[PDB]
């Protein structure tokens, strides 16, 4: 059954800390505890070991990523920015 | 029921003060200190155990106290790398060396272009 209408994973905090802080922390609470796709082996077996560290259970590849997500938004932009600069220099 | 006491002057339940209860031929229970658990050899990266070697305290591996066959594996990097790891290195060494030969030859054909 549906055990909580909206609280979800932040139900472990009971009635403490205020709704906004529970709502705010829910995004990162879900993301840091979720499985992520491993580009190396192709499995959804990447989980956070510590803040910024993401290891694949299957192939054993350990990757440095975001604090609470494997890939941050700025990380994608940096890769494309660096790629564009490399092409011009390597032209 | 019979209750026990430490047989030494160590009075605190530290990891090195572990014990087992033994019943002697005299019909009484007594403690005998048990050595801590040991990990045994493990692979440098994956951390999996190295097969064929028992798990003992470091001093128990001393050559005088352990037969040679129990602390060795008959293979290159035996006791240090698993069989899979050794296989990976051998193939990598051969294939990478072959690729170097291809690079060397490939640049000789272009060097003469003039």
């Amino acid at each position: 059954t549906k055990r909580t209408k909206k609280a979800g994973i932040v139900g472990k905090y009971g009635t403490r800390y205020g709704a906004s802080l529970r709502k705010q922390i829910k995004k990162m609470e879900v993301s840091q505890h979720s499985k992520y796709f491993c580009e190396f082996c192709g499995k959804y077996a990447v989980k956070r070991k510590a803040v910024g560290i993401w290891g694949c259970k299957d192939c054993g590849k350990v990757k440095a990523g975001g604090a609470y997500t494997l890939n941050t938004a700025s990380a994608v932009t940096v890769r494309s920015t660096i790629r564009r600069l490399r092409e011009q220099t390597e032209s | 029921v019979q209750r026990l006491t430490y047989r030494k002057r160590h009075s605190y339940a530290t990891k090195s003060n572990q014990h087992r209860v033994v019943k002697t031929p005299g019909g009484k229970l007594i403690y005998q200190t048990t050595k801590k658990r040991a990990n045994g050899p493990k692979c440098p990266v994956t951390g999996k155990r190295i097969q064929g070697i028992p798990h003992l305290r470091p001093a128990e591996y001393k050559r005088s106290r352990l037969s040679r066959n129990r602390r060795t594996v008959n293979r290159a990097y035996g006791g240090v790398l698993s069989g899979s790891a050794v296989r990976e290195r051998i193939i990598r060494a051969f294939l990478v060396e072959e690729q170097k030969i291809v690079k060397k030859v490939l640049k000789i054909q272009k060097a003469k272009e003039k």
Partner: protein
């Protein structure tokens, strides 16, 4: 009066940094011939957590240039680094995330981290999680480079200074609320003895300029001048302004 809390920190004692479990200083290789002229290949062996440091660290193994032995290094991990990756350091290293290049070889607009201030100092700028520096322009005549630091300040550095391509991994750490005094306790337990903080207005006059009074209140401007002596310099030090930063001020 007595020595205030701010003054007691300089003596060390119970205010020294908690460094028992730290893995060591994170820094580039020592500048040598290989990095000055060509490039040297390294391999990432593991990405580890350093207590008290948000950014993860990377252990890299290098082949020693002239000795028969391995050369171990500890780098601040850039976002995207992974174990088994090849890392190239030197003047002729390609522009890819993780490589360490001199600023002279890095084009304008690139994102870099752990930027050296002095050639060979092994990295002092943009080392915290999610932080980076942006290369602005090059000055071939002076042999210097302009970079934008995380605080938004522009600085001149010699073009020989090295920098790692990319941003520091672990970004977004501070967005998550702590929610608990205990979480703050664990955060500062591995940093130093700075938490919790008692407000000066809650103390007695003997131990703080803000102390005392039949009501809790400062009683004088909390903005203190730059040249105030230790023990008097509390509050907003040399404040150019105060109050909510609205408009262009918060730029």
């Amino acid at each position: 009066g007595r020595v205030i809390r701010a003054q007691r920190k300089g003596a060390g004692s119970v205010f020294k940094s908690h460094t028992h479990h730290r893995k060591g200083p994170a820094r580039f290789r020592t500048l040598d011939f290989g990095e000055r002229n060509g490039y040297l290949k390294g391999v990432i062996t593991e990405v580890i957590h350093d207590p008290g440091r948000g950014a993860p660290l990377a252990r890299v193994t290098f082949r020693h240039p002239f000795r028969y032995k391995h050369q171990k290094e500890l780098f601040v991990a850039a976002e995207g680094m992974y174990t088994g990756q090849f890392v190239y350091c030197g003047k002729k290293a390609t522009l890819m995330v993780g490589n360490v290049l001199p600023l002279r070889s890095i084009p304008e607009g690139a994102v870099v981290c752990n930027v050296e201030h002095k050639v060979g100092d092994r990295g002092v700028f943009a080392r915290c999680s999610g932080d980076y520096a942006i290369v602005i322009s090059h000055n071939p005549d002076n042999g210097t480079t302009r970079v934008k630091l995380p605080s938004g300040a522009k600085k001149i550095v010699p073009s020989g200074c090295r920098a790692m391509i990319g941003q520091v991994a672990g970004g977004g750490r501070t967005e998550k609320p702590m929610l608990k005094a205990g979480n703050a306790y664990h955060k500062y337990r591995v940093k130093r003895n700075c938490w919790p903080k008692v407000r000066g207005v809650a103390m007695n006059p003997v131990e703080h300029p803000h102390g005392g009074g039949n009501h809790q209140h400062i009683g004088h401007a909390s903005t203190v001048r730059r040249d105030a002596p230790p023990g008097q310099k509390v509050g907003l030090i040399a404040a150019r302004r105060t109050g909510r930063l609205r408009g262009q001020a918060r730029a």
